[PDB]
């Protein structure tokens, strides 16, 4: 199974300014089909603003752009990807502004 190595925002992090994106780095590459990061505010509204992209030169990295000037709130980045080894993986990265 692929595992998160690191993310920006980090899990349960408290940000100092509004982020432009959510970025996730996996220990092994992840595949194109069905990947996503969907980001929600605490009202359940979507705050990502673009389709999720696997980095063109690095299939370990997945990013999604965010709406500008997000307010102070608690957020949930819900992610899904298919591992290089075939296993579907998913999770949530909570963070706050």
Author numbering: 24 to 120
Sentences from the paper on this structure:
The ycnKJI operon in B. subtilis encodes a suite of proteins implicated in Cu uptake and regulation, including the Cu-binding protein YcnI and the putative Cu importer YcnJ. YcnJ from B. subtilis has been implicated as a Cu importer, proposed to use its membrane-bound CopD domain for Cu uptake.
We purified the resulting YcnJCopC protein and crystallized it in its as-purified, apo form. The overall fold displays the typical β-barrel structure of a cupredoxin fold observed in other CopC proteins. Of those CopC homologs whose structures have been experimentally determined, YcnJCopC has the lowest RMSD with the Cu(II)-binding CopC protein from Methylosinus trichosporium OB3b. The main difference between YcnJCopC and these other proteins is a disruption of β4. Another His and an Asp from a DxH motif provide a third coordinating nitrogen and a coordinating oxygen, respectively. These three residues are conserved in YcnJCopC, and the crystal structure shows that these amino acids are close to one another, suggesting that they may be involved in Cu binding similar to other metalated proteins in this family. Protonation of histidines also helps to stabilize these π–π interactions, so Cu binding may also destabilize π–π stacking.
